[PDB]
Design a protein around this ligand. Structure first.
Ligand SMILES: CC(C)(COP(=O)(O)OP(=O)(O)OC[C@H]1O[C@@H](n2cnc3c(N)ncnc32)[C@H](O)[C@@H]1OP(=O)(O)O)[C@@H](O)C(=O)NCCC(=O)NCCS
Ligand SMILES: O=C([O-])C(=O)[O-]
Ligand SMILES: [Mg+2]
Ligand SMILES: [Mg+2]
Length: 524
């Protein structure tokens, strides 16, 4: 049986109904052991890379890659996804996102949410109310927020396979957060979603292998069968946002063929994963974060391969997001929108079927680019990129050299520390220096600093990057943060705890896989 570590309040009584908990228990008991074996398999596969065998395509599955076959199908309401907005599962946010000038809202339990128990439960309440069409919110000023006609299509992003949900245990251990988030969104909403001609749709993050995709396929099939739904009722879009996964896109599509409708270039997790996965290769060190842009060869190759591979199988190839926040200053906002427009134009011209935004102020820009290139069509499924030569492992793994600067290092410290401080305080997405920071973008910043220390890289000013240099810069940059935020905000925050965690993970000889793992220990 499952144990719940917190007493039920009114919200738990809504979400954790006896029937919901029975269903969750079935998924946990049927699928948790296999999930743990998958996490163990990751260790061995990384060790093989660490020991000198770089990633490449899989030998034995060549027949799958060179065969003609397609995914099972795409629901009518997922035929046009030219712009999707992402946002966390907070109540007002859900309403504003569903009302935005977009096709889809991806409600997030993952990288943009700090997974406090109350926020995960409230998130399930909010999405149920949203599916049911009744969600409403009135703020302090007495302004009421409700869904407008024709709200966006809803897709739920669950926590990744590594994340525990520690407030529910089974056999003395936290259950998988992935199963918690999936089970409850599916269970509470499948009936209403299906009744209105939609379905239970998910975004699946941080996949590393086709076997992980196969596990999801088993989870989905079990869920469908439990409630006597037709096969392929549950539809997933799967982020290719780890370096191992870019070599297994066709195998992933095949393993999830009954449920999958698309892959997505999760560029920020992908860059983070490039650093983590190639941590033991001194020639694969990435430069200042702002220099790692989608026009760089390795990233352009990743996108073009994803586009060709998805379209070969009749699946969508979704783009990602640039992470620039609109400005309240008009002149400055013009510059922001011009760079967002440029980023989207690259995606649309390459053949992506749609793109992401994380702020409604970007919707008109993103929609205009996609409206222009799509014309009378709903997507770009027909774009096969036959002009492209084969894309090879050497191309996907190519170094990407650039300046490693003191300013870049200090910025990474400031970003990582401030992100950790927000996250441990319950805020998983925060604006910093005109950029939207969530777990993946902060992960790049902290992992980059570790990488420069690990390989004893020099900064462009000749300064050797060391644990000592980092520790001094950490204290110095904390003073900068205090000065920027003011005495009240800084003193009332958790910057002491954040700096401590940052120092621990940064000066460890081993690279921790995710900052969210030790970070979770600071959550109630
Ligand atoms: O506060 P703020 O984040 O500075 O608000 P901004 O002016 O930048 O954004 C305007 C609106 O976009 C909303 N918003 C920003 N990002 C969003 C997202 N990803 N999903 C849904 N709504 C979002 C804000 O909630 C705000 O709504 P409001 O005007 O009803 O309060
Ligand atoms: O998921 C994302 O947004 C990413 O990793 O880029
Ligand atoms: Mg609408
Ligand atoms: Mg991601």
């Amino acid at each position: 049986e499952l144990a719940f570590t917190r007493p039920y309040g009114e919200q738990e009584k809504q979400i954790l109904t006896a029937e919901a908990v029975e269903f969750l228990t079935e998924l946990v008991t049927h699928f948790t052991p296999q999930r743990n074996k998958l996490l163990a398999a990751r260790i061995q596969q990384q060790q093989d890379i660490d020991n000198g065998t770089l990633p490449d395509f899989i030998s034995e599955t060549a027949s799958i890659r060179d065969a003609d076959w397609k995914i099972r199908g795409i629901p009518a309401d997922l035929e046009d996804r030219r712009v999707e907005i992402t946002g966390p599962v907070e109540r007002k946010m859900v309403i504003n996102a569903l009302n935005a000038n977009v096709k889809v809202f991806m409600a997030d339990f993952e990288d943009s949410l700090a997974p406090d128990w109350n926020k995960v439960i409230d998130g399930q309440i909010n999405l149920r109310d949203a599916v049911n069409g009744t969600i409403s919110y009135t703020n302090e000023a007495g302004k009421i927020y409700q869904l407008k006609p024709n709200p966006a299509v809803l897709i739920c992003r669950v926590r990744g396979l590594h994340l525990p949900e520690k407030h529910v245990t089974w056999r003395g251990e936290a259950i998988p957060g992935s199963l918690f988030d999936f089970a409850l969104y599916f269970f509470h909403n499948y009936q209403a979603l299906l009744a209105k001609g939609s379905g239970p749709y998910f975004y699946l993050p941080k996949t590393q292998s086709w076997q992980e995709a196969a596990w999801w396929s088993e989870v989905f099939s079990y869920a469908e069968d439990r409630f006597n739904l037709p096969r392929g009722t549950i539809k997933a879009t799967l982020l290719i946002e780890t370096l191992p996964a870019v070599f297994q896109m066709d195998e992933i599509l095949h393993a999830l063929r009954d449920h999958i409708v698309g892959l997505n270039c999760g560029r920020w997790d992908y860059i983070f994963s490039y650093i983590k996965t190639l941590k033991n290769y001194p020639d694969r060190v990435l430069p200042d974060r702002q220099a790692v842009t989608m026009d760089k060869p390795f990233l352009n190759a990743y996108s073009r391969l994803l586009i060709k591979t998805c379209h070969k199988r009749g699946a969508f190839a979704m783009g990602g997001m640039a992470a620039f926040i609109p400005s309240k200053d008009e002149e400055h906002n013009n510059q922001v929108l011009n760079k967002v427009k440029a980023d989207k134009s690259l995606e649309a011209n390459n053949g992506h079927d749609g793109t992401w935004i994380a702020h409604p102020g970007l919707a008109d820009t993103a929609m205009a680019v996609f409206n222009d290139i799509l014309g009378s069509r709903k997507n770009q499924l027909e774009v096969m990129r036959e002009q492209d030569a084969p894309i090879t492992a050497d191309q996907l793994l190519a170094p990407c050299d650039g300046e490693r600067t003191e300013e870049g290092m200090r910025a990474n410290i400031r970003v990582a520390v401030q992100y950790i401080e927000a996250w441990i305080s319950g805020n998983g997405c925060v604006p910093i220096y005109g950029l939207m920071e969530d777990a993946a973008t902060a992960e790049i910043s902290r992992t980059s600093i570790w990488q420069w220390i690990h390989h004893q890289k020099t900064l462009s000013n000749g300064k050797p990057v060391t644990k000592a240099l980092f520790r001094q810069m950490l204290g110095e940059e904390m003073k900068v943060i205090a000065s920027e935020l003011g005495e009240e905000r800084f003193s009332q925050g958790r910057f002491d705890d954040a700096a401590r965690l940052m120092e621990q993970i940064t000066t460890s000889d081993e690279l921790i896989d995710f900052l969210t793992l030790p970070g979770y220990r600071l959550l109630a």
